[PDB]
Amino acid sequence: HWGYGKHNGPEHWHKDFPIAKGERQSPVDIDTHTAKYDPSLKPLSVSYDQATSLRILNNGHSFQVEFDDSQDKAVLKGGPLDGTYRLIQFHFHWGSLDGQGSEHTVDKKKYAAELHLVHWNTKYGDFGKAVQQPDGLAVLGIFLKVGSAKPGLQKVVDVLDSIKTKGKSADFTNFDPRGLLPESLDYWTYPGSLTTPPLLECVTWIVLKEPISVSSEQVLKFRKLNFNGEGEPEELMVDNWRPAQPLKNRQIKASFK
Numbered sequence: 106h107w108g109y110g111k112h113n114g115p116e117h118w119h120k121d122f123p124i125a126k127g128e129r130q131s132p133v134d135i136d137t138h139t140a141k142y143d144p145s146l147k148p149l150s151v152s153y154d155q156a157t158s159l160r161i162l163n164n165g166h167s168f169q170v171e172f173d174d175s176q177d178k179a180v181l182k183g184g185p186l187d188g189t190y191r192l193i194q195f196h197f198h199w200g201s202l203d204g205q206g207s208e209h210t211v212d213k214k215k216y217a218a219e220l221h222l223v224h225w226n227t228k229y230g231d232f233g234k235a236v237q238q239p240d241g242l243a244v245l246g247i248f249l250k251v252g253s254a255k256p257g258l259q260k261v262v263d264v265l266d267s268i269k270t271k272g273k274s275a276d277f278t279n280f281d282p283r284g285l286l287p288e289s290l291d292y293w294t295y296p297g298s299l300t301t302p303p304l305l306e307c308v309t310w311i312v313l314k315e316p317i318s319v320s321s322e323q324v325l326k327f328r329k330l331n332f333n334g335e336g337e338p339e340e341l342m343v344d345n346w347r348p349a350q351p352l353k354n355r356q357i358k359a360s361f362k
């Protein structure tokens with residue numbers, strides 16, 4: 106099955122998933138000089154006050170914190186988006202070294218990690234139907250750099266010991282994702298895809314310009330997770346990022362001058 110190794114990594118994915126070579130694949134390099142300010146972009150609205158987390162899961166590629174999305178609680182609206190998108194989960198991508206790990210890049214710069222807050226367009230009724238639509242998902246991407254600790258991340262870091270291996274989960278209630286957000290909501294936006302198989306072209310990407318800082322110890326704990334299941338040979342969960350893909354016939358728009 107697909108993964109991030111030499112024999113099953115991103116350069117192999119197109120064999121099982123030919124859309125890997127499609128017209129709106131993600132991630133991309135954000136060329137800041139070529140991105141254009143768009144006055145038509147409505148204000149961006151991140152409303153997470155009623156977010157209800159449930160569980161944290163090692164999914165074999167990364168780890169994810171899942172939310173109760175059976176009601177309109179935590180939602181993303183505005184910006185480039187038409188309608189309302191509901192938060193279902195967040196997860197991260199990260200490196201084996203601080204100098205790599207992000208999926209998007211900014212003028213070719215790679216960050217240590219990238220947080221993805223995944224939301225689905227409520228007009229499609231549930232997540233599985235939404236991923237079949239060109240405007241089905243909105244993913245808010247946030248870069249992580251290594252510096253000061255992010256206090257709001259520590260509760261996540263400390264439960265990772267309980268989900269070391271693939272398929273392990275743990276209860277994870279009352280976690281507030283507002284503690285993972287930078288000060289500014291200035292962003293770049295473009296139409297793209299999921300960055301793992303099945304690589305569906307269903308995502309409006311909204312990538313924040315301002316990174317959050319996390320500590321070396323916090324990201325080190327990400328790197329102690331395992332891709333493997335319990336009782337299997339240990340494979341450290343690191344470098345679970347897809348590299349930048351061709352921009353093709355797309356323009357990246359900026360929310361800011």
Ligand SMILES: CCc1cc2c(cc1OS(N)(=O)=O)CC[C@@H]1[C@@H]2CC[C@]2(C)C(=O)CC[C@@H]12
Binds near residue numbers: 171233302303
């Ligand atoms: C990989 C594409 C895909 C993923 C998913 C579903 C359906 C999918 O499309 S498809 N075509 O049915 O396979 C349904 C459940 C989803 C799961 C992703 C992780 C989710 C969102 C959570 O965190 C909790 C609910 C989980």
Ligand SMILES: CCc1cc2c(cc1OS(N)(=O)=O)CC[C@@H]1[C@@H]2CC[C@]2(C)C(=O)CC[C@@H]12
Binds near residue numbers: 166196299300
């Ligand atoms: C649907 C959003 C999305 C979900 C997921 C990933 C990437 C995503 O796209 S992105 N990076 O936000 O564009 C990476 C790993 C995925 C995880 C969902 C649960 C999965 C499918 C499993 O159970 C095994 C693999 C797990």
Ligand SMILES: [Zn+2]
Binds near residue numbers: 196197198300
């Ligand atoms: Zn992701």
